Amino acid sequence: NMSFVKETVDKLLKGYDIRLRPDFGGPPVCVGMNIDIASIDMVSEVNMDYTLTMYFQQYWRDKRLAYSGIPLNLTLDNRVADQLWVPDTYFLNDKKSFVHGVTVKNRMIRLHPDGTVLYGLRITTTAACMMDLRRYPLDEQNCTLEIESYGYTTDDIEFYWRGGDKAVTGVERIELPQFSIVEHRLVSRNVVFATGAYPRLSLSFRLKRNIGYFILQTYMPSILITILSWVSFWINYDASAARVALGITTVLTMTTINTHLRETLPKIPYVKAIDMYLMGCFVFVFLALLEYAFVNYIFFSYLTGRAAAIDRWSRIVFPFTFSLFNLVYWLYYV
Amino acid sequence: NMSFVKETVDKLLKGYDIRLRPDFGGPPVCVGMNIDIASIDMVSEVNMDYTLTMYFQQYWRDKRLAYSGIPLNLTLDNRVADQLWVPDTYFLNDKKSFVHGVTVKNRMIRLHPDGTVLYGLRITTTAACMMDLRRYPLDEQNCTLEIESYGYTTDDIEFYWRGGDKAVTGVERIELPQFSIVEHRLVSRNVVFATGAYPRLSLSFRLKRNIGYFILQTYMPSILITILSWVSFWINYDASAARVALGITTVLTMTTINTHLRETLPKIPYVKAIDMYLMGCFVFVFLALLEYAFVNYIFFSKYLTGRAAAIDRWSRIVFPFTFSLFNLVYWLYYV
Amino acid sequence: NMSFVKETVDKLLKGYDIRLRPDFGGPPVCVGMNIDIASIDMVSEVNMDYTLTMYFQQYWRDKRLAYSGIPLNLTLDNRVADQLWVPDTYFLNDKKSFVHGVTVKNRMIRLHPDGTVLYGLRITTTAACMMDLRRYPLDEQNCTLEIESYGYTTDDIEFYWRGGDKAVTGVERIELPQFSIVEHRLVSRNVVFATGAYPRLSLSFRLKRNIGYFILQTYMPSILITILSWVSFWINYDASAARVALGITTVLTMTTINTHLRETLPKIPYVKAIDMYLMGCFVFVFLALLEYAFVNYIFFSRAAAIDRWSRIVFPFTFSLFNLVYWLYYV
Amino acid sequence: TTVFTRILDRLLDGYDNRLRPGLGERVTEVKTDIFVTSFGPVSDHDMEYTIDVFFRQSWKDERLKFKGPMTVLRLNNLMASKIWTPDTFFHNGKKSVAHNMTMPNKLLRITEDGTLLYTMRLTVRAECPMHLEDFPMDAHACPLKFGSYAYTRAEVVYEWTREPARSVVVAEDGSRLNQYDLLGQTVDSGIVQSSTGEYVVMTTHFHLKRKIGYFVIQTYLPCIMTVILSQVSFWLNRESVPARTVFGVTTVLTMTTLSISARNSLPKVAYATAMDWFIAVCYAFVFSALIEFATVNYFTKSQPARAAKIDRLSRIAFPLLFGIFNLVYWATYLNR
Amino acid sequence: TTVFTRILDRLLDGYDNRLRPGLGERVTEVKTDIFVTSFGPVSDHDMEYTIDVFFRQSWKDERLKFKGPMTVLRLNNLMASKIWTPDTFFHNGKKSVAHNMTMPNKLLRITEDGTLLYTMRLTVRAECPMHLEDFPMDAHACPLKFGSYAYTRAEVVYEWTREPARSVVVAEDGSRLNQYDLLGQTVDSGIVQSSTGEYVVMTTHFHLKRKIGYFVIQTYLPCIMTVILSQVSFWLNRESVPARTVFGVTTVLTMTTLSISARNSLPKVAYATAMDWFIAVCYAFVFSALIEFATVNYFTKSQPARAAKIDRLSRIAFPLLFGIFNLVYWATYLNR
Amino acid sequence: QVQLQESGLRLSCAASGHTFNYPIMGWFRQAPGKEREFVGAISWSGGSTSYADSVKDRFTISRDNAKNTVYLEMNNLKPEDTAVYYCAAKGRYSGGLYYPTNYDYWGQGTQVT
Ligand SMILES: *[C@@H]1O[C@H](CO)[C@@H](O[C@@H]2O[C@H](CO)[C@@H](O[C@@H]3O[C@H](CO[C@H]4O[C@H](CO)[C@@H](O)[C@H](O)[C@@H]4O)[C@@H](O)[C@H](O[C@H]4O[C@H](CO)[C@@H](O)[C@H](O)[C@@H]4O)[C@@H]3O)[C@H](O)[C@H]2NC(C)=O)[C@H](O)[C@H]1NC(C)=O
Ligand SMILES: *[C@@H]1O[C@H](CO)[C@@H](O[C@@H]2O[C@H](CO)[C@@H](O[C@@H]3O[C@H](CO[C@H]4O[C@H](CO)[C@@H](O)[C@H](O)[C@@H]4O)[C@@H](O)[C@H](O[C@H]4O[C@H](CO)[C@@H](O)[C@H](O)[C@@H]4O)[C@@H]3O)[C@H](O)[C@H]2NC(C)=O)[C@H](O)[C@H]1NC(C)=O
Ligand SMILES: *[C@@H]1O[C@H](CO)[C@@H](O[C@@H]2O[C@H](CO)[C@@H](O[C@@H]3O[C@H](CO[C@H]4O[C@H](CO)[C@@H](O)[C@H](O)[C@@H]4O)[C@@H](O)[C@H](O[C@H]4O[C@H](CO)[C@@H](O)[C@H](O)[C@@H]4O)[C@@H]3O)[C@H](O)[C@H]2NC(C)=O)[C@H](O)[C@H]1NC(C)=O
Ligand SMILES: *[C@@H]1O[C@H](CO)[C@@H](O[C@@H]2O[C@H](CO)[C@@H](O)[C@H](O)[C@H]2NC(C)=O)[C@H](O)[C@H]1NC(C)=O
Ligand SMILES: *[C@@H]1O[C@H](CO)[C@@H](O)[C@H](O)[C@H]1NC(C)=O
Ligand SMILES: *[C@@H]1O[C@H](CO)[C@@H](O)[C@H](O)[C@H]1NC(C)=O
Ligand SMILES: *[C@@H]1O[C@H](CO)[C@@H](O)[C@H](O)[C@H]1NC(C)=O
Ligand SMILES: NCCc1c[nH]cn1
């Protein structure tokens, strides 16, 4: 019968003060959170934030909304969320967030017979993710989503992850382009501001960056350019135009790729750990030009023997030194 | 009197059912329309759209709102539109649009004693304009704004341009940077959907793209670099390094300008008119380099120098003629 | 003491018809406007507009809201603006405007015992002013903010700059990064439309682009690179590799500047002073390589002459071009 | 005149929009339909694609049964606020807007049998997975899934209005695809289990094919020209050492710039797709040309007889090797 | 159970929220405090900086006196709309959004003595002037000013909740500053004069210091590399005209390229910065080094003793000149 | 300020001053009894023109920027067109083109008969 449910639902909303939380004078109400992630796309370094889409569900108990005689579990329209009291959770890391509104404000209200209330939302959030780029692109980032109660202190409300470690789901099905979710954790804590102590749940992700795209874009061309400088060593000693053009254009290409690759990432006041490789390669090319200039100076300012000896020494030393530097760099970072 | 108008207005709205259109059971209501274009601000080739701001006036007859006694117009406060029936007209081409709301929601309601209502809005729309860039930038383009009723079929509402061809005004107020409006057009027709027929008006604009900037920016660097390549002909074949550097740097410059200018336009598969010209100039400089290499191979690999000089003068007299022929053909084909 | 004001305000608003303007049958209501320009933000040539922030106040006289026995003129909460009639003022140059809503919809309503009502807002607009770039970057600009009544004709409503010439304030405190506000002008007029005559207010700023950045960072590279091309003359003609390398790489640098400076200002059809200077520099570097080619052709077909004549011709011709350019545009 | 007002008042007497039809009697069968006015651009950078649809939903509500002069009442959107409607939402949506220009773009029609028709104009910006392994010559199947948010399968069950093949319809004029071609669509329905319960999810995949002309003209032609420059660098006399040096130099520089320019267009995928392989092979070609030039220059004086043989071998080998590489590459990738 | 409902109803017994407390009696005192949760990025391009704060306000209201079992009752955000609150606004804000996720991020607390506390989470994008004359070795004092909008000094007067230095406190973890260091802060209050009347405004100045570690490896190192390239251009012999020519011209090209690149990623301004000075001096050095070769090659044919003399003098002088210029520049800027 | 001079079947209206600030230029006519009426108008670019109903496809308006001039050409003249003609300039935002009040500056009346 629809009229029975009609009058039951009408009676439930008589004398129901939305201003007062459930059990206003009694012990704090326990709210159980649950999360189902859809995507973590757009992990931006320039913006220092990540976009997260999430089904966020909250379970609690409200004696005022208990009903009997209706065995089924009332799935009410989302508009009923305006009448009922709902928790006041809020994300600390968020910059811009919204609840989806495609054809309806995407919310769900479910009333169980025992007064238990389930409140579900579909939220998109742009949460700040501070990053330590001192090992970029060989870094492993840690950043989180914090969930806090705004108005109600710990003595008026308490949070807990419903289902323990199974509260958050969908982490396995997430495939970022240039990242891999290694591990994730759930933590519950109390934060003591000036006003008082509030609960805080937190879901933390540790992301690991891929390497293939970065190495293929950045590191390999520097290697080829250094090998061109070594070709400049090998080619001759007296052919001034060929060697000098090759070296100066080697420097030109190195600074060209440096300028093109310097604009991808944001401003940070330290070596980015990919800049170190570019500076090393630039320094190697620079020393190639320096030793070429030294060869011309000693030759033009017996002498042919010195020039040949220095050329052999350079061509046998520089590749070995570059290999040593490369191994030291890779072992240090990777 | 003051209270007389107040009680008359209160009597008008009393018993007024906004859910039902005027003449609910009777024949369809006619809705004349006027558009006054403030400006067409953006025309984006990356986004395939254009921004358009306009005063949009609708005019219809509602016998329920007829009043007597008061002999002058009623220019009511525009909040009254919240409690009145208005046609539900939408622009089928819009992507993002909004009614301007600076200091008040920019609307106006004017009721006349015979019951005719005039409803004015100040709308801005980012309308979609699909466009063919085959002849870009020598292209004569078309854009449209496409008005239609959503809820009501042709059996319940009629659209017409109030004032005929003079319905749309303010065309002279449009001053785009590069485009020039050749001539506009107004069309009215019934479109058939699955649910049923619907009235549908269409404003159309034919834009012509100015060319002088395209010339001065993109084109004449290409001709300039082509003649840079040609300068290698008037150099002694013995100085191989000079001709090599000249030709190879001209090719490098062609690559640089091509890759620095390609990104401006969207990813269009078919080759644009400008891309044909850039490829032609690339081919010309490439052939200059190749024929120099051919001369060098013939010579190095009395009599031979004569052949080299013959080839050099042949190239000197042939390359300008062939390039002029290609340029004239290209310009005449696209103009 | 407190409930007295409550009942007075309740009495004022009950029976108040927001729909009907004050003096519906009487003469038009005079709305005295006033502006305080907080700051003129960025002025994008690309967007062909400028962002403005302004405290926008307007006074009028509603006899319906007259009260007595309360000498203190009331500063009511902004929510009461929903219950009162206000003018349908709007802007014509705006493309996207909004009233700030930081902790409250930023509005103020101040009633006075005589019946005068002051209505204030804090508005931020993106007003479009078309710019003439023929003289760019040595050009003047006129950018205007225009105010109209959307619905009410001049028979119903009337505007006037309250305080006369002193209506708009705060312009002197503004310091734009490049432009300089040389003067501002207030105008009041009556614009005739098809529907009828409407009242118009206008605040027009004259902007002069300060020239100390483009002159140093744009023209100087091209000038120095043309002098660089001229350096090739002093090198002997026998060093063909040096001459062709210098000329061709000067051309390469010039086109690099040309293709990297396109991010300065948007697509426009007509020629610009900056474009004229760039094109002059481009042709002047080109004629160096052209006359060098003539030198080689004449020599290998007397030539030191070609060069000697060129050494004085090219700087003189470029100086003449520079003087003509500066005289024409200044 | 005013009889319809009385009918509407009677319909909304004792009517609650919070309770679905048949709340304890039967499952609500919500027939649905989509008409795609315009298939928006597919942004590979943002992993997304836009679409504009007339989303239609029809269901029977016995509460809204009336007998009146007219068979069908074509009410405005205002009634939709005061009436029960399904909770449909798009599972893979990112940021969608329901257009409300002038008035809310919603059509509501009520039939004398209680049947309802609720149509609305949506602009859905959905997320599409992109297996870019065969980039830029890769087909795709971008999905669009929708279903109820709150009601499980036991409460609300969706269906296609007409036959599923004819259900989703795409307007012919509204393409709005710059570099993609739509190869038809395939629809289906299924049940998705979740934490709350089983839900009916209706999916439609749009098949897309990349258009290659822009990419070939932008990337492969410049790369082919640069490697051809490296090829013709061989043919000059050996003694012109600066000449061949500057060919190798400038060819490598141009190739690096073109590689960067081609690379900026792709997304941040961590695998060489097909342009990376082409660019790597063209690197190998130009560096091989420069290296063997250095070799013959080294041997130009000690043993000036093997240099001619090496040059002849290079001329016969490098162009043929590049040609067969191009043939096998194009045959392998185009046929897929 | 229902005692608090009737208490709340009795509180709003003809309570007019449009009237300030003590409207005809005295000036209401609004003690306020700020807790900066985060200091967002400072966008010099957009001439603004972002901050995320818990803006707190506290004022005594006699009309909201009550007597109940619990001394202090904490209410939701709906009561906030139903009572008078101050109209505090930021004078220099550009586009600030009050967060509204889940439900409006605010809180209201009422005490038996009529004391009332009202806090809200805010994100303020405030504009602050910047003098880039000493860029990038430039400090800034970006202000954040706020005060009432409608009510004047006589109608409302604000105050700091505690001692002013301790009133505004910044969260340690929430820095969100990459190229700046928050070198403390200060607060103050003052009476701004306006046409409507004198208002009370409080400012807090955040002292920022730009970090040079990025800009040094951005610009100042490649410039020095090009200058040393010119020096090794000097070190070469005189016979090889094309070697020194290509050094000079390519160094000019690289200098121009990096000079435009550094200028591009900066806000437009009508005066020369320190980086502009450095770039100009480096360009001057490069051009000087090339014209020195122009002179040397001109004079090498006739009387090469002068050519050798000027070459030796230039080799001795140019590195010394560059070194002393660099020392003067760094001593001028880094010392302050 | 914009100065306009009339010359003159064919008529010419020159322009000098801040012609950019006053794009639209219009032609009006007046008989000794009949009041001023809108004959035609042309924009700054000149691509868009408007004419009154009574002077459709008989009059013509052209714009040349050689010295900031516009030209009005009459064809199929009739005795009812004998009148004095004015050339005026309109501001950027001044409303409709058909009303003399919007136009700011006016050229000296040129008689035609
Ligand atoms: C990414 O990086 C972030 C860093 O920002 C990590 O965040 C920390 O995560 C760890 C583990 O997940 C947290 O450790 C836990 O804190 C809980 C909070 O309890 C408070 O409890 C009492 C209150 O009086 C005090 O002890 C103290 O004030 C605590 O702050 C603890 O209850 C937890 O204790 C449990 O773990 C310990 C250690 O294993 C056991 O000995 C205990 O018996 C008990 O089982 C625990 O200590 C830490 O608080 C988080 N810090 C912050 C700042 O949030 C992410 O975890 C990390 N994630 C990934 C995937 O990399
Ligand atoms: C930019 O590009 C668009 C797209 O091509 C152009 O839009 C087309 O514009 C033309 C006008 O130039 C439109 O032509 C009009 O259609 C009318 C029909 O409306 C009806 O539909 C059916 C017709 O069977 C009937 O129910 C009823 O008549 C409706 O009115 C025609 O009446 C118009 O005129 C023709 O017929 C009469 C009588 O036979 C002839 O005397 C006329 O000369 C003419 O042949 C006209 O054909 C066309 O409909 C538009 N396309 C669409 C899809 O609607 C824009 O015009 C273009 N921009 C510019 C500035 O030209
Ligand atoms: C930047 O660019 C803008 C836009 O072009 C310029 O604005 C123009 O500014 C001038 C100067 O203020 C305006 O000129 C005037 O029109 C006013 C209104 O005019 C009519 O309406 C009134 C009232 O109904 C009638 O009485 C009158 O007869 C007209 O029908 C006049 O009131 C002004 O009068 C002043 O000048 C006259 C003549 O010298 C004097 O006799 C008066 O006493 C008074 O001093 C004036 O005629 C013009 O309208 C503006 N253009 C518009 C609105 O399109 C800016 O001036 C320019 N410069 C700057 C710095 O911004
Ligand atoms: C209320 O506001 C009015 C403003 O209209 C105040 O009126 C004036 O008093 C000031 C100060 O003496 C003068 O500068 C103005 O010229 C006066 N204007 C008038 C009388 O129209 C009035 O003082 C205010 N009253 C209170 C109690 O604040
Ligand atoms: C109502 O919800 C509870 C939650 O677990 C479930 O166990 C129960 O079966 C539901 N009722 C019905 C009738 O399905
Ligand atoms: C936006 O849509 C809502 C839908 O409820 C509507 O009320 C509002 O008027 C729309 N905004 C406009 C027309 O500016
Ligand atoms: C969100 O903010 C709006 C203000 O636009 C407010 O009306 C609403 O109550 C807030 N909460 C929700 C759940 O919408
Ligand atoms: N505010 C004037 C709107 C208008 C346009 N056209 C006629 N009236």
Q: What's the CATH number where E166 sits?
A: 2.70.170.10
Same domain? For E225 and E265 the reply is yes
Write the CB contacts of C9 (distance below 8 Å, at least 6 apart in sequence): C74, C76, E16, E18, E19
Output the CA–CA distances (angstroms, integers) from residue B100 to B106, B125, B170, C145, E46, in the order listed. 6, 11, 18, 16, 25
Output the CA–CA distances (angstroms, integers) from residue D50 to A104, D43, D177, in the order listed. 19, 8, 10
B48 vs D contacts (CB less than 8 Å)? 41, 176, 178
Same domain? For D72 and D197 the reply is yes
**Integer Cα distance of C47 and A160 in angstroms:** 51
**Chain C residue with the nearest C-alpha to that of E249:** C246
**Integer Cα distance of E154 and E132 in angstroms:** 40
Write the CB contacts of B272 (distance below 8 Å, at least 6 apart in sequence): B133, B134, B135, B136, B265
* Cross-strand partners of E193: E198
A251 vs E contacts (CB less than 8 Å)? 225, 229, 250, 254
Cβ-based neighbour number of residue E302 at 10 Å: 8
**Integer Cα distance of E256 and E253 in angstroms:** 5
Asked if residues B262 and B279 have their Cβ atoms less than 8 Å apart, the reply is: no
Identify the residue whose tokens are 């200044």.
Answer: C330
Ligand 2 atom, smallest distance to B206 CA = 60
Asked if residues C165 and C186 have their Cβ atoms less than 8 Å apart, the reply is: yes
| Dihedral sign, Cα of residue D257, residue D259, residue D264, residue D269 | negative
DSSP assignment letter at D100: -
Technique used:
cryo-EM
Please provide residue A298's backbone torsions phi and psi, each rounded to the nearest 5 degrees: -65, -35
* Cross-strand partners of D67: none
3-state secondary structure of F43: coil
Same domain? For E166 and E238 the reply is no
**Residue B139 half-sphere exposure, CB side, CA atoms within 13 Å?**
16
Cβ-based neighbour number of residue A114 at 10 Å: 12
Same domain? For E189 and E226 the reply is no
Selection from E296, E322, E51, E304 nearest residue E170 by Cα: E51
Selection from D120, D150, D156, D89 nearest residue A78 by Cα: D150
Crossing angle for the helix pair A240-262 and A220-235, to the nearest 10 degrees: 170
Q: What is the 3-state secondary structure (H, E, C) of B20-33?
A: CCCCCCCCCEEEEE
**Integer Cα distance of D91 and D148 in angstroms:** 9
| Dihedral sign, Cα of residue C252, residue C254, residue C260, residue C262 | negative
Name the burial class of residue B245, with classes exposed (0-12), middle (13-18) and buried (19+) by CB atoms within 10 angstroms of its CB: buried
Name which residue sits closest to atom 22 of ligand 1, judged by CA.
A189
Ligand 3 atom, smallest distance to C206 CA = 60
CATH architecture of A2-210: Distorted Sandwich (2.70)
Output the six-digit token pair for E307: 């050519």
From F76's Cα to the closest Cα of chain C, the distance in A is 30
Write the CB contacts of C137 (distance below 8 Å, at least 6 apart in sequence): C209, C211, C214, C273, C274
Selection from D82, D132, D123 nearest residue D99 by Cα: D123
Write the CB contacts of A310 (distance below 8 Å, at least 6 apart in sequence): A291, A294, A295, A298
CA of A116 to the centre of ligand 5 (A): 11
- The response to whether D300 counts as a known ligand-binding position is no
Please provide residue E242's backbone torsions phi and psi, each rounded to the nearest 5 degrees: -70, -30
Among D193, D211, D229, the domain boundary falls at D211
Asked if residues A106 and D149 have their Cβ atoms less than 8 Å apart, the reply is: yes
* Cross-strand partners of A159: A31
CATH architecture of C214-329: Up-down Bundle (1.20)
DSSP secondary structure of E98-143 = E--SSS--EEEEEETTSEEEEEEEEEEEEE----GGGTTS-EEEEE
DSSP assignment letter at B271: P
**Integer Cα distance of C128 and C106 in angstroms:** 24
Burial A210-220 (b: 16+ CB within 10 A, else e): beebbebbbbe
Helix or strand run (H / E) with residue A331: helix A303-333
CATH architecture of F2-112: Sandwich (2.60)
**Integer Cα distance of B55 and A22 in angstroms:** 52
**Integer Cα distance of C248 and B244 in angstroms:** 11
Same domain? For E159 and E117 the reply is yes
Selection from A63, A129, A68 nearest residue A94 by Cα: A129
D300 vs A: CB within 8 A: no
C-alpha triplet C121, C126, C129: angle, nearest 5°: 125
Find out whether the beta carbon of E103 lies less than 6 Å from any atom of ligand 7. yes
**Integer Cα distance of D270 and D289 in angstroms:** 29
Specify the long-range contacts of residues D315-322, CB closer than 8 Å, at least 24 apart: D315/D234, D315/D235, D318/D231, D318/D234, D318/D285, D318/D288, D318/D289, D319/D231, D322/D227, D322/D231, D322/D285
Output the CA–CA distances (angstroms, integers) from residue B236 to B292, B296, C229, C299, D137, in the order listed. 11, 11, 22, 10, 48
Asked if residues D51 and D87 have their Cβ atoms less than 8 Å apart, the reply is: no
Same domain? For D150 and D67 the reply is yes
**Residue D123 half-sphere exposure, CB side, CA atoms within 13 Å?**
15
Asked if residues B58 and B138 have their Cβ atoms less than 8 Å apart, the reply is: no
Output the six-digit token pair for C19: 């729909």
Ligand 2 atom, smallest distance to B183 CA = 60
Asked if residues E22 and E59 have their Cβ atoms less than 8 Å apart, the reply is: no
Helix or strand run (H / E) with residue B199: strand B197-209
In angstroms, what is the C-alpha Rg of chain F? 13
Cβ-based neighbour number of residue C190 at 10 Å: 15
Among E211, E238, E267, the domain boundary falls at E211
**Integer Cα distance of B210 and B207 in angstroms:** 10
Write the CB contacts of F56 (distance below 8 Å, at least 6 apart in sequence): none
Same domain? For E141 and E282 the reply is no
Cβ-based neighbour number of residue F108 at 10 Å: 11
Selection from D120, D144, D132 nearest residue D51 by Cα: D144
**Chain A residue with the nearest C-alpha to that of D259:** A217
Asked if residues A113 and A67 have their Cβ atoms less than 8 Å apart, the reply is: yes
Output the CA–CA distances (angstroms, integers) from residue A312 to A36, A317, A326, D102, E157, in the order listed. 65, 8, 22, 81, 83
Among D211, D235, D264, the domain boundary falls at D211
Please provide residue D98's backbone torsions phi and psi, each rounded to the nearest 5 degrees: -90, 115
What CATH number has the domain bearing residue E292? 1.20.58.390
Please provide residue B57's backbone torsions phi and psi, each rounded to the nearest 5 degrees: -105, 130
Give the fold, CATH level 3, of B213-334. Answer: Methane Monooxygenase Hydroxylase; Chain G, domain 1 (1.20.58)
**Integer Cα distance of E94 and B297 in angstroms:** 69
B239 vs D: CB within 8 A: no
Identify the residue whose tokens are 């390229």.
Answer: E257
Torsion of Cα atoms, E90 then E96 then E101 then E104, to 10° = 30
DSSP secondary structure of D29-73 = EEEEE-EEEEEEEEETTTTEEEEEEEEEEEEE-GGG----SSSEE
3-state secondary structure of C270: coil
Pairing relationship of beta strands C98-99 and C116-127 according to DSSP bridges = antiparallel
Q: Which domain holds residue D275?
A: 214-335
Find out whether the beta carbon of C73 lies less than 6 Å from any atom of ligand 4. yes
B171 vs F contacts (CB less than 8 Å)? 48, 50
Asked if residues B240 and D240 have their Cβ atoms less than 8 Å apart, the reply is: yes
Pairing relationship of beta strands B168-169 and B179-192 according to DSSP bridges = unpaired
Asked if residues A51 and A126 have their Cβ atoms less than 8 Å apart, the reply is: yes
Cβ-based neighbour number of residue C106 at 10 Å: 22
**Ligand nearest to the backbone CA of C101:** 7
D20 vs A contacts (CB less than 8 Å)? 75
**Integer Cα distance of A271 and C118 in angstroms:** 58
**Integer Cα distance of D320 and D231 in angstroms:** 11
DSSP secondary structure of A100-149 = --SSS--EEEEE-TTSEEEEEEEEEEEEE----GGGTTS-EEEEEEEEEE
Selection from C176, C96, C100 nearest residue C128 by Cα: C96
Same domain? For D42 and D108 the reply is yes
Q: What is the CATH number of domain C3-209?
A: 2.70.170.10
Minimum-distance CB partner of B268 among D178, D237, D254: D178
C103 vs E: CB within 8 A: yes
In angstroms, what is the C-alpha Rg of chain B? 32
Q: Report how many domains make up chain E.
A: 2
How much of chain B is helix, strand and coil, in % rounded to 5?
A: 40, 30, 30
DSSP assignment letter at D216: I
Best mutation target, E9, E11, E58, E102, to test chain A (most A CBs within 10 A): E102
Identify the residue whose tokens are 């040393």.
Answer: E228
Pick A213-333's CATH classification: 2.70.150.10, 1.20.58.390, 2.40.110.10, 1.10.3720.10: 1.20.58.390
Give the fold, CATH level 3, of B3-210. Answer: Acetylcholine Binding Protein; Chain: A, (2.70.170)
Domain ranges of chain C: 3-209, 214-329
Strands (E), chain E: 28-43, 48-60, 72-75, 88-90, 97-98, 106-111, 115-127, 139-148, 156-160, 168-170, 180-193, 198-210
CA of D100 to the centre of ligand 6 (A): 5
Ligand 8 atom, smallest distance to C194 CA = 7
Pairing relationship of beta strands D28-33 and D156-160 according to DSSP bridges = parallel
Asked if residues E190 and E167 have their Cβ atoms less than 8 Å apart, the reply is: no
Cβ-based neighbour number of residue C19 at 10 Å: 18
C231 vs E: CB within 8 A: yes
Selection from A113, A35, A26 nearest residue A74 by Cα: A113
A243 vs D contacts (CB less than 8 Å)? 245
Strands (E), D169-301: 169-170, 180-193, 198-210
In F, what residues contact C, Cβ < 8 A? 20-21, 92-96, 98-99, 101-102
Write the CB contacts of D176 (distance below 8 Å, at least 6 apart in sequence): B48, B128, B130, D38, D39, D40, D41
Q: What is the 3-state secondary structure (H, E, C) of B90-124?
A: EECCEEEEEECCCCCCCEEEEECCCCEEEEEEEEE
Cβ-based neighbour number of residue A150 at 10 Å: 23
Output the six-digit token pair for B19: 């859910």
Selection from E182, E183, E181, E199 nearest residue E191 by Cα: E199
* Cross-strand partners of D133: none
DSSP assignment letter at D274: S
Please provide residue B43's backbone torsions phi and psi, each rounded to the nearest 5 degrees: -135, 95
**Integer Cα distance of A260 and D8 in angstroms:** 67
Pairing relationship of beta strands A179-192 and D88-90 according to DSSP bridges = unpaired
| Dihedral sign, Cα of residue E266, residue E268, residue E273, residue E278 | positive
Asked if residues B335 and B138 have their Cβ atoms less than 8 Å apart, the reply is: yes
Find out whether the beta carbon of C72 lies less than 6 Å from any atom of ligand 4. yes
